[PDB]
Amino acid sequence: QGYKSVNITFELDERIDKVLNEKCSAYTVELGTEVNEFACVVADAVIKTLQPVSELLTPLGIDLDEWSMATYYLFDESGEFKLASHMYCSFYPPDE
Amino acid sequence: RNSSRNSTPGSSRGTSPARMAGNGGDAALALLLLDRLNQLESKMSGKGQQQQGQTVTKKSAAEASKKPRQKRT
């Protein structure tokens, strides 16, 4: 028995990038993890550990209200659902 | 000013790069929220953590792929 853990990038670029990439970017998949539950799981980890602060996050520059209400899509190349070492978690479709 | 002890700036002067990576440490303004809450929620025994991330969900990702459910209708 073995778990397949990988690193994901959810909106991270020039803010909280290395912080959450090193702290909460390695999740367990291939044991029954999907892509939709992957977006909700990454969103839940970041929203559960980083959200209880708010005091430093609101003057910092981010809103923190669009991370809990708005969900992101996970893709590897162009826009396909595949499991790789480094997956991209970002928004691509239009907003209604 | 404000800070005198603990935490250093690292490197300030530089012209000829050799390693490229390695200024002083990690994060400058995100270290407060990261260290405070990430270590505040920690209740497990370890003290010396080298690699972060091992487990996240078990009942949320395994129950969705094993038993499909419909929403709204």
Q: What is each CA distance from A89 to A7, A24, A85, B63, in whole angstroms?
A: 10, 13, 13, 22
Compute and round to an integer the Cα radius of gyration of chain B.
21
Q: Do A26 and B34 touch (CB under 8 A)?
A: no
Q: Which of B26, B32, B37 to mutate to test the interface with A (most CBs of A within 10 A)?
A: B37
Nearest to A20 by CA among A55, A62, A59: A62
Residues of A within 8 A of B44 (CB-CB) are none
Q: Which of B57, B60, B69 to mutate to test the interface with A (most CBs of A within 10 A)?
A: B57
For A24-82, the DSSP string reads S-EEEESSS--SHHHHHHHHHHHHHHTTTT-TTHHHHT--SSHHHHS--EEESSSS---
Domain boundaries, given as residue ranges, for chain A: 4-90
Terminal-residue alpha carbon distance, chain A = 43
Q: Does A58 touch chain B (CB under 8 A)?
A: no
Closest A-chain CA to B64: A37
Residues of B within 8 A of A16 (CB-CB) are 30, 34
How far, in Å, CA of A41 to CA of A33, rounded?
A: 10
The method of structure determination was: NMR
- Say yes or no: domain A4-90 is CATH 3.10.20.350: yes
| Angle between helical axes of B59-66 and A36-49 (0-180°, round to 10) | 160
Question: Are A38 and A29 within 8 A, CB to CB?
Answer: yes
Residues of A within 8 A of B30 (CB-CB) are 15-16, 19, 60
How far, in Å, CA of A81 to CA of A74, rounded?
A: 7
